Design a protein around this nucleic acid. Structure first.
Ligand SMILES: [Mg+2]
Ligand SMILES: [Mg+2]
Ligand SMILES: [Mg+2]
Ligand SMILES: [Mg+2]
Ligand SMILES: [Mg+2]
Ligand SMILES: [Mg+2]
Ligand SMILES: [Mg+2]
Ligand SMILES: [Mg+2]
Ligand SMILES: [Mg+2]
Ligand SMILES: [Mg+2]
Ligand SMILES: [Mg+2]
Ligand SMILES: [Mg+2]
Ligand SMILES: [Mg+2]
Ligand SMILES: [Mg+2]
Ligand SMILES: [Mg+2]
Ligand SMILES: [Mg+2]
Ligand SMILES: [Mg+2]
Ligand SMILES: [Mg+2]
Ligand SMILES: [Mg+2]
Ligand SMILES: [Mg+2]
Ligand SMILES: [Mg+2]
Ligand SMILES: [Mg+2]
Ligand SMILES: [Mg+2]
Ligand SMILES: [Mg+2]
Ligand SMILES: [Mg+2]
Ligand SMILES: [Mg+2]
Ligand SMILES: [Mg+2]
Ligand SMILES: [Mg+2]
Ligand SMILES: [Mg+2]
Ligand SMILES: [Mg+2]
Ligand SMILES: [Mg+2]
Ligand SMILES: [Mg+2]
Ligand SMILES: [Mg+2]
Ligand SMILES: [Mg+2]
Ligand SMILES: [Mg+2]
Ligand SMILES: [Mg+2]
Ligand SMILES: [Mg+2]
Ligand SMILES: [Mg+2]
Ligand SMILES: [Mg+2]
Ligand SMILES: [Mg+2]
Ligand SMILES: [Mg+2]
Ligand SMILES: [Mg+2]
Ligand SMILES: [Mg+2]
Ligand SMILES: [Mg+2]
Ligand SMILES: [Mg+2]
Ligand SMILES: [Mg+2]
Ligand SMILES: [Mg+2]
Ligand SMILES: [Mg+2]
Ligand SMILES: [Mg+2]
Ligand SMILES: [Mg+2]
Ligand SMILES: [Mg+2]
Ligand SMILES: [Mg+2]
Ligand SMILES: [Mg+2]
Ligand SMILES: [Mg+2]
Ligand SMILES: [Mg+2]
Ligand SMILES: [Mg+2]
Ligand SMILES: [Mg+2]
Ligand SMILES: [Mg+2]
Ligand SMILES: [Mg+2]
Ligand SMILES: [Mg+2]
Ligand SMILES: [Mg+2]
Ligand SMILES: [Mg+2]
Ligand SMILES: [Mg+2]
Ligand SMILES: [Mg+2]
Ligand SMILES: [Mg+2]
Ligand SMILES: [Mg+2]
Ligand SMILES: [Mg+2]
Ligand SMILES: [Mg+2]
Ligand SMILES: [Mg+2]
Ligand SMILES: [Mg+2]
Ligand SMILES: [Mg+2]
Ligand SMILES: [Mg+2]
Ligand SMILES: [Mg+2]
Ligand SMILES: [Mg+2]
Ligand SMILES: [Mg+2]
Ligand SMILES: [Mg+2]
Ligand SMILES: [Mg+2]
Ligand SMILES: [Mg+2]
Ligand SMILES: [Mg+2]
Ligand SMILES: [Mg+2]
Ligand SMILES: [Mg+2]
Ligand SMILES: [Mg+2]
Ligand SMILES: [Mg+2]
Ligand SMILES: [Mg+2]
Ligand SMILES: [Mg+2]
Ligand SMILES: [Mg+2]
Ligand SMILES: [Mg+2]
Ligand SMILES: [Zn+2]
Lengths: 229, 112
RNA sequence: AGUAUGAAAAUGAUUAUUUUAUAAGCAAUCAUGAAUAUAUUAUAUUAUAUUAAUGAUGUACCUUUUGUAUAAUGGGUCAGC
RNA sequence: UCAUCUGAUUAAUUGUGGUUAGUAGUGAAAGACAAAUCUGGUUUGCAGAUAGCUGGUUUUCUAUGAAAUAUAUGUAAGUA
RNA sequence: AGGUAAAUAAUCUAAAGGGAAACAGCCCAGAUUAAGAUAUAAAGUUCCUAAUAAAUAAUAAGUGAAAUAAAUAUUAAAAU
RNA sequence: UGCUGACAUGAGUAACGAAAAAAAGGUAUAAACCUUUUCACCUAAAACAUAAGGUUUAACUAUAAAAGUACGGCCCCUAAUUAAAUUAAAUAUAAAUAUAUUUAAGAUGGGAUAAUCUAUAUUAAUAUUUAUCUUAAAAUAUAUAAUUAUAUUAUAUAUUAUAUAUUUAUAUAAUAUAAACUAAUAAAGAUCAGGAAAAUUAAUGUAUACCGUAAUGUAGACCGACUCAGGUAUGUAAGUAGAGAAUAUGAAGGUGAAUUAGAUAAUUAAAGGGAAGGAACUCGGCAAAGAUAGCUCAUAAGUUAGUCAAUAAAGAGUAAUAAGAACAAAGUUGUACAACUGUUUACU
RNA sequence: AUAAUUGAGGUCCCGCAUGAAUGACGUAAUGAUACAACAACUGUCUCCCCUUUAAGCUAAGUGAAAUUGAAAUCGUAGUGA
RNA sequence: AGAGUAGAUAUUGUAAGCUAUGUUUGCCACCUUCGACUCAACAUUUCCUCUUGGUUGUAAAAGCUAAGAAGGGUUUGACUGUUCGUCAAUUAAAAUGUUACGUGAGUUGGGUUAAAUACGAUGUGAAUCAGUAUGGUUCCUAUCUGCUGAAGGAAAUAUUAUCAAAUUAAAUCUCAUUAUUAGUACGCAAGGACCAUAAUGAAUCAACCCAUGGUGUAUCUAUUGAUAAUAAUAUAAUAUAUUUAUUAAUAUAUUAUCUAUAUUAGUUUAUAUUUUAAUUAUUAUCAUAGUAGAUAAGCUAAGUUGAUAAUAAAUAAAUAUUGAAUACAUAUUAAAUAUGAAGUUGUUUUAAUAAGAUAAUUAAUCUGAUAAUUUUAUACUAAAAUUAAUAAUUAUAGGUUUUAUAUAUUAUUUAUAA
C-alpha cells in the first residue's frame, strides 16, 4: 500500500481509471506523450496486459485461458474508440511479442514542458509496424524513425555510424526478420529524405541499407588481472 | 511571527545568493543529437527530430475532413444569402490572434 | 490631472577599486600598515582621494522625567508640505 | 464549513409592497434592533466647541543663567 | 527599606574630563579653540594597563588581594 | 502612532478559494482555448423553464420578431398605504404644518370572448382551514332470493350500434389498465368565523397601437470591497426502490474550474482499522463509540386519564444464523429550576 | 453510594442571613437547562501503532500581510530607570 | 533551665542571646492569573540507595540522631477548579525548593474574570458584595537570538581515495525481591543479621521484525441495490467478396435491439397492437475502500534481542601505624607509613574532529561533479547501489521467468493418450 506503485496525487479509484485510460490510448495510438511518472506507471499496466494476452493465447489449460481473458477485460475500458480493443489485443498487438520476454514498451524522455516544467515522456509500443498493408505509413515506433534519421544524417556527412546507433539497430533487429527490417528502413528513408529535402537515388540508398544491415548482423588496459603469488 | 527590524541589504542578499542550493547551476549535461547535429539534453530525445516525426505521422495518419456535399456545391451568391458575415466580439478577436499568446518551440544551437 | 526638462533622494540590478571565510557588540572617531586611483612643477624618499590589516576609545536619536543604552515615548526610508 | 442537535399545521416559514426612528421608533424585554452593532444612528452646520491633559514647534554664533521652597488656592498635573 | 518626613552642606538636576571593573547623586576637577614641553589633583605603578624601588614587623589561612559576617569555640602571643 | 507621494522590508515567503482527470487532433504554437473518444461529478441538481437584479455579460452590430385563446405589462378595478391636491368661514395650528372629508394615485391581488377558433369599440333604450370517510349502491367469487369475503362507485374520450332534426346536429345503449397528479364538481367538519372595487338587449363597428422577449439567474453574468464554500423568489424535476421530495443509482442534460507537475519527512486537518483492557481520561464520558427491523404485534409503574408516560424499556412475528449498500431509528434513573409549545443578547 | 467521594441523593435543624401571588409546598408531562448515578459502548485513557486523502517539502507560473530608529543582532557573571 | 527509671548535652532543649535564607505572611512603591497537560533544566537544606561517628538510652532485628554523598531514583487512584488536604492501594522512597511561585507566539480554560439571569444579605433607590449559583471571546505563515536536524562554501602545517589515534561534546551510571552463607553470629526466649555472591525481576535506554499481534485505498473471495460495457447467439440493415439465375444462398466487416397507436385530462408503468427491435458468458462504475471475511511487503508494540559499561587510580566523611614539637599524649593544622563511598578520575557507548598511516600521482579507464536507473537513504539535499553490452567478468529499476506467500474453489480434478 506504500511503495507498491506511484500514487500520482489521485485517490485510488481515480488513479486506476487513469492508468486504464492510458493503457487503452497506448494500444490505440501505438505511441503517446504524457508526463513521466504517468508514463512509467502506464507502461507497467500495459506490459502486464500484453503478457496476460500472450498467456491466454499460448496456454493449453482452458480454465486458465478464460481467467486470463477475464483479467484482460477487467483491465480495459471497452467503449467508443476502444469497442474492438480486446480483439486488437488478441489478433494484432499480442502476436508481435510472442518471442520477446518482457519489455514491450519504451518510455523515452523528452524536454520538460515549458508552462509547467513537468518532466515529459513518450510511452510507446516496441516493434510497432511502420507500414500497414495499405500504401501508407503508421503512427508509432518513434525510436526506429529517429535511428533511421540519424543514419541518414551520418550518410549525408559521410561519417561512420556511432557505436550507440549500431547497438540500437542491433537491438531493433533481434526480434525482426532481416529482409523485413531492411524494407522498413527503406520505407522510412523515402519519407524522411523528402521531409528533410535530400535526394532519393533509390539503388544507392538500398545498398547503404544493406551495408548497415551486414555490419549489424555479422558479429566480430590500465590494470592487469594476475593470480595470487 | 513578525520581523523585528527592516532586514538590511547585506543580510537579505547573503540569504538569497550566498548558498549554492539557491543559485542556478550550469547545464553541463548537454550533448549532440545524432539525427540533427544540435544541442539536446543528455538521456533525452531531440525535440526537433521527434517533432518532425510527429508532424510526418500527422500528415500521413490524417483523418479526412468531412465536407458536406450540399455546402460544397452551393453557389457563391446562395452561400452569402444563407450564411452571412458577422462582427466578432472583442474576446473572440483576442482568441483568434493566437500568435499574441501562444509560444512556438525554438530551435537549439548547432553543436561543435 | 498643464507643458517641457530632470546625474534630487529613497530603491533595484550590474561592473570597477579595495577589505573580508579563527571573529563577537550604535558600525563612528582617532592612531596606523598595505592596495588602488588621480595628479601638464611626483624634482621625490611626492601630494590628495578611495578602501571594516591591525590597535585604542566609543551604552543611537528625540520626548518625558529625580533619573533612560534602557526591555519607557515616537520614528520603515527618502522627497515635498 | 463540517459533524451533531432542535422545531417542522403553527405564537410556523416566506415573496411582493406599505406604516412607524433620532428625546427617538420597534422591542414574547437582551439596554435588544433602528443599513456590518445604538445606556440612543447618520449627515451637514454651530465649529478652529472646550481640553489646568498628551504630543509637536524647523539655522548658527556669543554673554549671563535658575527652580523643584514659603504662602494662597474646590488646591495639591494648574495658577498667583 | 533604593522607605517616609523635614534640618545643614555638596554634587546631580543643567557638568563634559580623570578615578571608583561597569556607575546621574561617591573621590578629584568645571570643556572658548588648539598645542603637548613643565607642574600636578583624586586614583594608581607584575601583565592585561599609562607608571616603582626600598625598609621594619605580621600572616600561611590564597586569610586576603576596592563591596571587612555576629555571638561563641579552639589554638597560640604578650603583660600582670 | 504628523499629511501626501514614491520606494523598500517581511519575500519570491504564504497563498492561488470545497472539485477527477486522460489521450488524440486543431497547431513540428497549448496543463489552462475548441473538437472527438474515454473516465468521473451533480442528478426534487451543478438539469430544464422562469422571477428580481445587474458594467449586454449572450450563440452580438447582417442583434433578442406578438390582436388574443396553460402570454405578461400597458388598460379597467380596487387593498395596504400615499398626495405644496380637494372643501368671509371644513377644523386646528408661532411658521413649517397637522386633522377630517372628497378626489386622485397605488399590485403583491380581481378582470369578457375563444381551435367549432374569438372580437374588447360607439350609439340608443329599460372563495379561513382541513376532509372526501362511514352508510348506501351495484359488481365479482365462495356456500345455501339472503349471508360471507373482495375490490369498484361524482366529472375528464375515442370506437361501434341505435332512435330523432337533415354526411352535418341532438339524445340513448354497449366496449375499454394499475399507481400517482391536475382542474372543475358536489356534499361538510372546526372555531380562530374567512378582502376591496368595476347592468342587459338591439343597431352600427373592428384594417387590430405601445413596452417586455438575448444570455445569466442555489450564480464567473445579482447582494456580499474579490470570477468570495455566505445571502437570493417560483414551477418541472427519466426510470428502478421505497411510506416518502428519505436513501442508493443516474436515462437525458450540464459540468470537470486563473494554478500545475512531482514527492507524500516531521507536523496539522478531515477520514478508516486496531491486540489485551474498558472511563483507569478529563473540570465533566468533551469527542468518539454504541441501532439484532423501519412493517405488524405487544408494551409498566406513576399520572392532571391524555397509549400523558410511548417512538416506553425489555420482548415477539416476518427475515437471517459466520458476516456481506445507504438513509430513518442512539439507553435507564435520581435531584435542582421552570407547568407546557414558544421568545431572547443578528456577530462570545 | 465508592477499594478510597469537598460531588449526588436521603435525613437532622443554632435558618451567619427561609417563608406564602418579589407567591409557599409536593407531583404527572415537557427541557439541546444544571448536577449526580447505573447500563452499554468505545483510541477518552493505559499507550500508542498502521492506513487514506488535502496541505506541508521540491520544480514551474503568479504573488500577500502584520512589522521595521539604524544594525557588523553569541554564552555566563557583574552592573544598571 | 528542664525532661530523659539514675546523668543538662543517647534522644530531647522553655523564655531570653547571635546569625543565615529570600522558600511564607507582611512593609516600601524604583517598576503599571491559580490549577491541569507537555517537556523539563538546576540546587542540596538527602526522602530512598552507597560510606561512616554516637546511641547507661547500639545484644540481634527494627530504630533514633549526626558526618560524607546530588551517580541513579523519587506513584497510581476516589473527592474537590484547586496547589494543598482527607482517604484507598502500592513503593526501596513516595525529600524540599529554584527556574517571571519554569513552561498559554507549546495545549487546556475547571477556578478567577465583563456583558444575561437568579438567590441571601446591604441600600429609599439606581445598584452593590474579602457572598453563592447557571451561562459565557482573543489571534499570530517565526526577521534576529537560541536549540534540533541537514547541506553548500572554506585555508589543507596545503592533493586525492581510503583507514583513522589522542582529544572535544554528550550519553550511560541503577534499584528491588528471593535464594545461599544461616535459623549460623547475637538472644533467657521472642525474634534474627553484617561481610559477600548468585538468580529472578524493575525502571530506563538501544536496536530489531524470524515469529506473534495490529494495520495493510497491494490483493482475493463473498455480498445488496442501480447503471453501463465487451463477447457469443438470434434477428435486421448497409458495405465488401464468393456462389447462383439484379435476384437468392454463403463468408467477412460495420451499425442497430429503438419506434409508434390503444386502455375517458396529464405523468409513469403494464399489457395488446406495431416493428428485426435477442437472451446467456465475462467485465466495469457508483454507493465510507458500498458492506463483510481473509490478507503479501513495509511500518509497528502487545512482540523479540541486548545493555544499567568492568578491572584500575586518587579521594570525602570516618578508621589507623610509628612519632616528636610538648620526659606524657597525639593517625600529622609535623617528617614518614596505611585503610576508606551508588561520589571523582576513568572505563563503556554515540557524535564531531582528522594528528598519523597505506596507496596513486596530468591521466587511451587519474579523482570528483553535472546526466540517467534507483534505495540500502531521503523534506530539498546528502549517503549508498548501478549506468554491462567486449577478449573476459559487474542486474539499478521495470518487464519477463521462478519458486514461494496470499485468496478459495479443487482428485466428482489436470495433462498425455488409446
Ligand atoms: Mg468509491
Ligand atoms: Mg506475474
Ligand atoms: Mg582570517
Ligand atoms: Mg566585550
Ligand atoms: Mg545611565
Ligand atoms: Mg527602545
Ligand atoms: Mg534592544
Ligand atoms: Mg514604533
Ligand atoms: Mg417536540
Ligand atoms: Mg442588565
Ligand atoms: Mg454602521
Ligand atoms: Mg448591541
Ligand atoms: Mg462659537
Ligand atoms: Mg478643533
Ligand atoms: Mg558661569
Ligand atoms: Mg534646590
Ligand atoms: Mg503645585
Ligand atoms: Mg491641576
Ligand atoms: Mg527637569
Ligand atoms: Mg554648578
Ligand atoms: Mg560625569
Ligand atoms: Mg570654563
Ligand atoms: Mg580570596
Ligand atoms: Mg569581596
Ligand atoms: Mg515627519
Ligand atoms: Mg515558488
Ligand atoms: Mg514555506
Ligand atoms: Mg521565513
Ligand atoms: Mg505551497
Ligand atoms: Mg478552485
Ligand atoms: Mg496537442
Ligand atoms: Mg426521481
Ligand atoms: Mg449551470
Ligand atoms: Mg437556464
Ligand atoms: Mg429571462
Ligand atoms: Mg385609477
Ligand atoms: Mg398604477
Ligand atoms: Mg398585477
Ligand atoms: Mg430564453
Ligand atoms: Mg456585484
Ligand atoms: Mg466581505
Ligand atoms: Mg459562491
Ligand atoms: Mg437525493
Ligand atoms: Mg448519463
Ligand atoms: Mg481497543
Ligand atoms: Mg477484543
Ligand atoms: Mg478519574
Ligand atoms: Mg487522573
Ligand atoms: Mg456526546
Ligand atoms: Mg396502570
Ligand atoms: Mg440519526
Ligand atoms: Mg422553557
Ligand atoms: Mg433568533
Ligand atoms: Mg449571540
Ligand atoms: Mg462524606
Ligand atoms: Mg467523578
Ligand atoms: Mg439565608
Ligand atoms: Mg401575604
Ligand atoms: Mg407581594
Ligand atoms: Mg423548548
Ligand atoms: Mg556578526
Ligand atoms: Mg533534671
Ligand atoms: Mg527558644
Ligand atoms: Mg549535604
Ligand atoms: Mg542494630
Ligand atoms: Mg562514577
Ligand atoms: Mg508561574
Ligand atoms: Mg513570548
Ligand atoms: Mg435580595
Ligand atoms: Mg451552553
Ligand atoms: Mg514483522
Ligand atoms: Mg516477515
Ligand atoms: Mg498473523
Ligand atoms: Mg505485518
Ligand atoms: Mg491494483
Ligand atoms: Mg390520458
Ligand atoms: Mg432487433
Ligand atoms: Mg453520484
Ligand atoms: Mg525487554
Ligand atoms: Mg557498574
Ligand atoms: Mg613517646
Ligand atoms: Mg597512639
Ligand atoms: Mg568505589
Ligand atoms: Mg557501456
Ligand atoms: Mg534486483
Ligand atoms: Mg550475467
Ligand atoms: Mg528486473
Ligand atoms: Zn535533432
Amino acid at each position: 500500500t506504500v511503495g507498491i506503485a506511484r500514487k500520482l496525487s489521485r485517490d485510488k479509484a481515480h488513479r486506476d481509471a487513469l492508468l486504464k485510460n492510458l493503457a487503452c490510448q497506448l494500444f490505440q495510438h501505438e505511441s503517446i506523450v504524457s508526463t513521466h511518472a504517468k508514463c512509467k506507471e502506464a507502461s507497467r499496466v500495459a506490459e502486464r496486459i500484453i503478457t496476460w494476452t500472450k498467456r491466454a493465447i499460448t496456454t493449453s489449460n482452458s480454465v486458465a485461458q478464460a481467467e486470463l481473458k477475464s483479467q484482460i477485460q477487467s483491465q480495459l475500458f471497452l467503449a467508443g474508440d476502444n469497442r474492438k480493443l480486446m480483439k486488437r489485443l488478441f489478433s494484432e498487438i499480442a502476436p508481435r511479442y510472442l518471442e520477446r520476454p518482457g519489455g514491450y514498451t519504451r518510455v523515452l524522455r523528452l524536454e520538460p514542458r515549458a508552462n509547467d516544467s513537468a518532466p515529459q515522456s513518450v510511452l510507446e509500443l516496441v516493434d510497432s509496424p511502420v507500414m500497414s498493408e495499405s500504401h501508407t505509413v503508421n503512427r508509432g515506433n518513434l525510436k526506429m524513425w529517429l535511428l533511421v534519421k540519424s543514419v541518414i544524417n551520418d550518410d549525408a556527412n559521410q561519417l561512420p555510424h556511432n557505436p550507440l546507433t549500431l547497438q540500437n539497430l542491433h537491438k531493433v533487429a533481434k526480434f525482426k526478420a532481416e529482409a523485413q527490417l531492411h524494407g522498413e528502413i527503406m520505407l522510412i528513408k523515402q519519407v524522411l529524405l523528402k521531409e528533410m529535402s535530400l535526394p532519393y537515388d533509390e539503388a544507392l540508398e538500398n545498398e547503404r541499407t544493406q551495408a548497415l544491415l551486414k555490419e549489424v548482423y555479422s558479429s566480430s588496459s590500465s590494470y592487469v588481472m594476475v593470480p595470487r603469488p | 511571527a513578525v520581523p523585528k527590524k527592516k532586514v538590511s541589504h547585506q543580510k537579505k542578499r547573503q540569504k538569497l545568493y550566498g548558498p549554492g542550493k539557491k543559485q542556478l547551476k550550469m547545464i553541463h549535461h548537454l550533448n549532440k543529437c545524432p539525427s540533427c547535429g544540435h544541442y539536446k539534453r543528455a538521456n533525452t530525445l531531440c525535440m526537433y527530430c521527434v517533432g518532425q516525426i510527429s508532424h510526418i505521422w500527422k500528415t500521413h495518419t490524417a483523418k479526412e475532413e468531412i465536407k458536406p456535399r450540399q455546402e460544397e456545391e452551393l453557389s457563391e451568391l446562395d452561400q452569402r444569402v444563407l450564411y452571412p458575415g458577422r462582427r466578432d466580439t472583442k474576446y473572440t478577436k483576442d482568441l483568434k490572434d493566437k500568435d499574441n499568446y501562444l509560444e512556438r518551440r525554438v530551435r537549439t544551437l548547432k553543436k561543435d
